[PDB]
Amino acid sequence: MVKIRLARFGSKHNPHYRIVVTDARRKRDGKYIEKIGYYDPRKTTPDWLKVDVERARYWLSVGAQPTDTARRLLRQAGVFRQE
Amino acid sequence: RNLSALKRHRQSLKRRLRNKAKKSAIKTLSKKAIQLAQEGKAEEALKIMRKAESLIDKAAKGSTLHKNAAARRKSRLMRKVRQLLEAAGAPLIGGGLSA
Amino acid sequence: MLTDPIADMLTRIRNATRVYKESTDVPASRFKEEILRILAREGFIKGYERVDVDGKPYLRVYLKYGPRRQGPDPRPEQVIHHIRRISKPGRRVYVGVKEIPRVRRGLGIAILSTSKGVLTDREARKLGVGGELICEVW
Amino acid sequence: PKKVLTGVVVSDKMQKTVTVLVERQFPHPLYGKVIKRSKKYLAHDPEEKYKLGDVVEIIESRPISKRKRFRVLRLVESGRMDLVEKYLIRRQNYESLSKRGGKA
Amino acid sequence: GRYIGPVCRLCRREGVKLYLKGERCYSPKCAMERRPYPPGQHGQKRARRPSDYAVRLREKQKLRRIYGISERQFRNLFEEASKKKGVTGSVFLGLLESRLDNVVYRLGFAVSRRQARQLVRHGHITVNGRRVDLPSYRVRPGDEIAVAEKSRNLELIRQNLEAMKGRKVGPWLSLDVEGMKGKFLRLPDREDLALPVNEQLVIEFYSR
Amino acid sequence: PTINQLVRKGREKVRKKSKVPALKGAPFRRGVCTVVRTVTPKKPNSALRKVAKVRLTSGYEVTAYIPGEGHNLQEHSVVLIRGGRVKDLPGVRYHIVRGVYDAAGVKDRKKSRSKYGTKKPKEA
RNA sequence: GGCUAAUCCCCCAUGUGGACCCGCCCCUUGGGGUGUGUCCAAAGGGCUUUGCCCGCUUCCGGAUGGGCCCGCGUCCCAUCAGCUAGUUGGUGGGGUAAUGGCCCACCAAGGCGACGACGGGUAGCCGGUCUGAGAGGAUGGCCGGCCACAGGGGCACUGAGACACGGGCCCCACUCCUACGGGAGGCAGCAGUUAGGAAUCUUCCGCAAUGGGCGCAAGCCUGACGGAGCGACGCCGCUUGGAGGAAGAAGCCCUUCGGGGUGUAAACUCCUGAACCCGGGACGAAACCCCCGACGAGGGGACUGACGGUACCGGGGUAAUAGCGCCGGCCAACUCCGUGCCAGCAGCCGCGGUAAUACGGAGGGCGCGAGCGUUACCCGGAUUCACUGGGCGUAAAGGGCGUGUAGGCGGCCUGGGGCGUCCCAUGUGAAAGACCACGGCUCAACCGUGGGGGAGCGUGGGAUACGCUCAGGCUAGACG
RNA sequence: GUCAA
RNA sequence: UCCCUACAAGGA
Ligand SMILES: [K+]
Ligand SMILES: [K+]
Ligand SMILES: [K+]
Ligand SMILES: [K+]
Ligand SMILES: [K+]
Ligand SMILES: [K+]
Ligand SMILES: [K+]
Ligand SMILES: [K+]
Ligand SMILES: [K+]
Ligand SMILES: [K+]
Ligand SMILES: [K+]
Ligand SMILES: [Mg+2]
Ligand SMILES: [Mg+2]
Ligand SMILES: [Mg+2]
Ligand SMILES: [Mg+2]
Ligand SMILES: [Mg+2]
Ligand SMILES: [Mg+2]
Ligand SMILES: [Mg+2]
Ligand SMILES: [Mg+2]
Ligand SMILES: [Mg+2]
Ligand SMILES: [Mg+2]
Ligand SMILES: [Mg+2]
Ligand SMILES: [Mg+2]
Ligand SMILES: [Mg+2]
Ligand SMILES: [Mg+2]
Ligand SMILES: [Mg+2]
Ligand SMILES: [Mg+2]
Ligand SMILES: [Mg+2]
Ligand SMILES: [Mg+2]
Ligand SMILES: [Mg+2]
Ligand SMILES: [Mg+2]
Ligand SMILES: [Mg+2]
Ligand SMILES: [Mg+2]
Ligand SMILES: [Mg+2]
Ligand SMILES: [Mg+2]
Ligand SMILES: [Mg+2]
Ligand SMILES: [Mg+2]
Ligand SMILES: [Mg+2]
Ligand SMILES: [Mg+2]
Ligand SMILES: [Mg+2]
Ligand SMILES: [Mg+2]
Ligand SMILES: [Mg+2]
Ligand SMILES: [Mg+2]
Ligand SMILES: [Mg+2]
Ligand SMILES: [Mg+2]
Ligand SMILES: [Mg+2]
Ligand SMILES: [Mg+2]
Ligand SMILES: [Mg+2]
Ligand SMILES: [Mg+2]
Ligand SMILES: [Mg+2]
Ligand SMILES: [Mg+2]
Ligand SMILES: [Mg+2]
Ligand SMILES: [Mg+2]
Ligand SMILES: [Mg+2]
Ligand SMILES: [Mg+2]
Ligand SMILES: [Mg+2]
Ligand SMILES: [Mg+2]
Ligand SMILES: [Mg+2]
Ligand SMILES: [Mg+2]
Ligand SMILES: [Mg+2]
Ligand SMILES: [Mg+2]
Ligand SMILES: [Mg+2]
Ligand SMILES: [Mg+2]
Ligand SMILES: [Mg+2]
Ligand SMILES: [Mg+2]
Ligand SMILES: [Mg+2]
Ligand SMILES: [Mg+2]
Ligand SMILES: [Mg+2]
Ligand SMILES: [Mg+2]
Ligand SMILES: [Mg+2]
Ligand SMILES: [Mg+2]
Ligand SMILES: [Zn+2]
């Protein structure tokens, strides 16, 4: 089914993923459906994690299934908080 | 050599045969129906027509003839039968053709 | 029959000026007149006016020139140095507002015919419209 | 939106089918000059309703046959053999080119 | 690598004194004193009217030979300058003048440019307190160029910063002699520089 | 020509002909020597120019020049052609590369050494 | 041949509903609703085992993916001009998820072509890339998208999906096994061998990260991928030293034999200190899981690093790679000797036949520098296929002349339409790239984030000067 | 007869 | 080789 996962966009030893919505079957760095975030696993910037929290919701709402790592980042950005 | 996932081939054969079989039936009864319908044997032809209907939808339950393919078959049959019957005798067994 | 009455006029004017004529006639047409209107406004010509050479409508175009000059060949400068037909029958040229050309950093002009009427490049530009780029002049 | 094209009927020699000639003018990609090309469309006429010389609207349609993908929307005006003529003449010229030519 | 060879032989070819050694190019001997003519067996013969080309080339050579940069690096900066807004001539100059190895020299931490180079390569220098060993590092306005804490005791650095006592410094540069630290205030104006080079001819040399 | 004409016929892009059918327009093509003849220059010049008839791997047989003073080529020498004609000998359009295969590199060459394929001598 | 389990196969029931025929209604190509008739459902398993979890069935919808159709665009030859029988259309069938000569039966005799059909040659197409002031020319490796193929040809089965690269069947070629009847096989997956060639690499490490498949999970598989290896192949960074030092060593090169040059260059003094040696030593990795809470939100805890003892930090510390092309003009850089139309140079012009700045060597010089040259190819300069931007009296170029077909072009006035043309709004123009800005690796190359663009096409609205078209009129063109 | 000057 | 002029030729 469609997914929300990480696409590799950094460079050798300089990873930078794009939190993405794409068909599970597509190659990972291939044509995604929508960019909904980005993550710098090495926090080399105070902005190593950003998520279109609304947009995430949208897709989750229509079946998007997140990778475990993707889900993790989504939680961190408060995509699942209720209060 | 030796990729145990040639198990898929064995299955395909079993499946193939299982499919091939249901279809043969379908055809034979269908023909049978349009035949009797074409001979004015209303009650008899509708009787068989229903079998064919049933057998078709059943075929559609699984991969056999699954789909609108079933629908098409049913349609095309209830077509020929009702026409051939209109070309002479009234629908007795009320088979499946509606009022 | 003239193949292109506009080029014809533009030319009569080009020719006449080179032998420094005072006026010069041209078979009249409203469109043709509309062009003269600009020529006049812009001060390339003294002006024009209808007339009837043999009971047929023409347009006297009174030409302007510079002052007599110094040494050999005291012929005055031309007010209308350049005047070239652009869009032609057999190759019409149309331009969108963002493509109206800038004739000689402004020292010159371009006459386009637009649905809002015949205008100079600045006018057309100001009025936000394009059209058939008729001819340039400077 | 299904394309709607306007053209003239040049042929009704087909059962329920008329050939509609359609022109379009436009700037030449490099030379500017407005050039004018054309194309024939085989449109569907189930009622045989339209005739030779009719100017009609053609509309994008579900395939009716290999080669037939348009239906005759409506009659715009009719009786323009002039357009038919041109086409016919232009066609006449053809068989007057190759080693099989003929008239002057 | 850098040039690495007879340096005052260039002052000679360009007919104009360049300060490749800085010091000594002040003595009664930058050679520009004795034999201020081109190097080689013909350095004294009658010069021949140089070609429009010859002229621009020589002029570019001079400019680049001053900062002792490679033609490759040189050219790349120039291209960067063209693309950039503002007068290529001046901007190009600002950029050359922004090379750290250069600034170090401008602040006197070292006598010549070549020396100021080695001072960066050998870690003796610091931008905003962080060590930086790239001659080509681009110093920006605000950045403070200091002497490496651990090397503030080198005999060489002593004398050099000592001599800077009471010495003046470029308008775009500030210099606290005690704390052995300076500051790139702004990019220099063509006006601020006094180079024996008509940068205009260079822009030409590359437009060919 | 009129625009109409240009519309009808348009300009014609003309393609250039290769001066080096060393096929596959490769940069070099290998071959073997048929003849290791000698030739006389054209008009203004006069001398005994060295040449070679070469059977190419490109299934071609052409004459190639032998740059340099030295020269050790015989009727079966495997050699590498590099393209580049000799303006003095009509019909010679490729030079032989000295330093590759059976083509010895010019000896005692101290200047333009890279061309002529001559390794650096030990300075001493 | 015999036995047997199931989420395997079948029958009966239940009919939310759905399928089909006929009718009616709305809607308009086969969309939606309704009535009668007929037909069609299912699978169980796990526990923290009586109530939760994984799953099953029928249907409506979402989402993602995709099939099919249409306008426009997409190389060279007219020394290819006529092409066509499933050919073009029809009716009725078959087929499919679905339209369609897609296929078939029968009827009609059509369809296409100079706006280039048919034939021949060449070729995966695009985002883009190179070049250019631009218009344009050339191009399509890497990366992303689409297509096609999996030794050559054909075919279908299974399935949501294939006519399936590591599935199946037959024919052909080839290799191999063979007890000669008959079998096995397909690297255009990674790595590697061999052949061809001017030429293109490791039979490496790992599953730690991202991603994929199956599984409740633990986890398994993953030559996808993350890394390391080899090659100046490319781009970027860096080193071979820094300061001082003679009216100037020696050698070598010149010489008017007075001297000039190599040159502060070396030697030598002082200084720093690439390499190397000690020590410390990482981000990338926090999830899945587990406990609390409710298997949710939320909180707490544990495990995991190929790269690698690598990066980076600190201590110590040696003065230690320079080459290649060129110096007649174009084009920066000159003298001696050798040679004597020879040996040879040569991109074009050209140079060598006794004093050659052009050959070969040396000294000197210029250019660039871990590179420098060469060859090949592309754009440029080339307004030298000219649209921007050219020409044809004598330079290449007016057809021997005419008639007239298609086509291109069309005087003056008014009106309608609004096709061309212009304007507004709106959709589209994926990412990467390109441009600007800020930012992360000490810089940069490289990379991240953000911003600005855009022609073309679709849609709605508008304008009407010019062109077009329709309607009427005029007489200056034409004809009588 | 040929190259050059 | 020489004569011829740097050669072709011709000449010893
Ligand atoms: K669905
Ligand atoms: K679709
Ligand atoms: K292309
Ligand atoms: K292109
Ligand atoms: K260290
Ligand atoms: K040393
Ligand atoms: K020389
Ligand atoms: K070129
Ligand atoms: K002629
Ligand atoms: K003729
Ligand atoms: K009107
Ligand atoms: Mg299995
Ligand atoms: Mg049977
Ligand atoms: Mg004119
Ligand atoms: Mg003029
Ligand atoms: Mg008809
Ligand atoms: Mg049909
Ligand atoms: Mg600039
Ligand atoms: Mg052109
Ligand atoms: Mg000669
Ligand atoms: Mg049995
Ligand atoms: Mg079942
Ligand atoms: Mg119900
Ligand atoms: Mg049942
Ligand atoms: Mg049908
Ligand atoms: Mg059907
Ligand atoms: Mg067909
Ligand atoms: Mg056409
Ligand atoms: Mg063809
Ligand atoms: Mg091909
Ligand atoms: Mg150009
Ligand atoms: Mg194939
Ligand atoms: Mg095949
Ligand atoms: Mg193969
Ligand atoms: Mg095969
Ligand atoms: Mg199936
Ligand atoms: Mg297959
Ligand atoms: Mg394989
Ligand atoms: Mg080989
Ligand atoms: Mg590799
Ligand atoms: Mg993994
Ligand atoms: Mg995983
Ligand atoms: Mg395995
Ligand atoms: Mg890899
Ligand atoms: Mg290589
Ligand atoms: Mg020194
Ligand atoms: Mg794990
Ligand atoms: Mg020179
Ligand atoms: Mg000799
Ligand atoms: Mg040479
Ligand atoms: Mg480098
Ligand atoms: Mg051109
Ligand atoms: Mg040419
Ligand atoms: Mg032109
Ligand atoms: Mg010309
Ligand atoms: Mg002549
Ligand atoms: Mg002539
Ligand atoms: Mg004539
Ligand atoms: Mg005509
Ligand atoms: Mg008109
Ligand atoms: Mg017309
Ligand atoms: Mg009108
Ligand atoms: Mg319109
Ligand atoms: Mg737009
Ligand atoms: Mg946008
Ligand atoms: Mg984009
Ligand atoms: Mg930075
Ligand atoms: Mg960006
Ligand atoms: Mg519109
Ligand atoms: Mg003779
Ligand atoms: Mg000669
Ligand atoms: Zn000096």
H/I helix tally of chain B: 3
The amount of beta strand of chain F, in percent, is 15-25%
CATH architecture of chain F: Beta Barrel
CATH-defined fold name of chain F: OB fold (Dihydrolipoamide Acetyltransferase, E2P)
- Tell me the domain tally of chain F: 1
CATH superfamily of chain B: Ribosomal protein S20
Counted up, domains of chain B total 1
Helix fraction bin of chain F? under 10%
Name given to the CATH homologous superfamily of chain F: Nucleic acid-binding proteins
Strands of chain B, total number: 0
Molecular shape of chain B: elongated
Order of helices and strands of chain B: HHH
The structure class of chain F reads: mainly beta
Can you offer a commentary on this structure?
The structure is cut from a larger assembly and holds chains A (83 residues), B (99 residues), C (138 residues), D (104 residues), E (208 residues) and F (124 residues). Chain A has helices at residues 53-61, 68-76; strands at 2-8, 17-23, 34-35, 37-39, 49-51, 65-66. Chain A has 83 residues and is α+β, with helices and mostly antiparallel strands. In chain A, strands 3-2-1-6 form a 4-stranded mixed beta sheet. A two-stranded antiparallel sheet of chain A has the order 4-5. The termini of chain A are far apart. Chain B has one domain (1-99): Ribosomal protein S20 (Methane Monooxygenase Hydroxylase, Chain G, domain 1), CATH 1.20.58.110. Chain B has 3 helices and no strands. In chain B, helix 1 packs antiparallel against helix 2, helix 1 runs parallel beside helix 3 (68-86) and helix 2 (42-61) runs antiparallel to helix 3. The longest helix of chain B is centred in the N-terminal third of the chain and has 31 residues, at 7-37. Chain D has one helix at residues 81-94, and strands at residues 4-14, 17-28, 32-44, 55-65, 68-77. Chain D is mostly beta strands and 104 residues long. The radius of gyration of chain D is 15 Å and the shape is globular. Chain C binds chain D through residues 90-94, and chain D through 27, 31-34. The structure holds potassium ion (11 copies), magnesium ion (60 copies) and zinc ion (ZN). The site of one magnesium ion (MG) has 4 residues of chain C, from strand 3. Chain E binds 3 RNA strands through helix 1, helix 2, helix 3, helix 6 and strand 2. It is classed as ribosome.
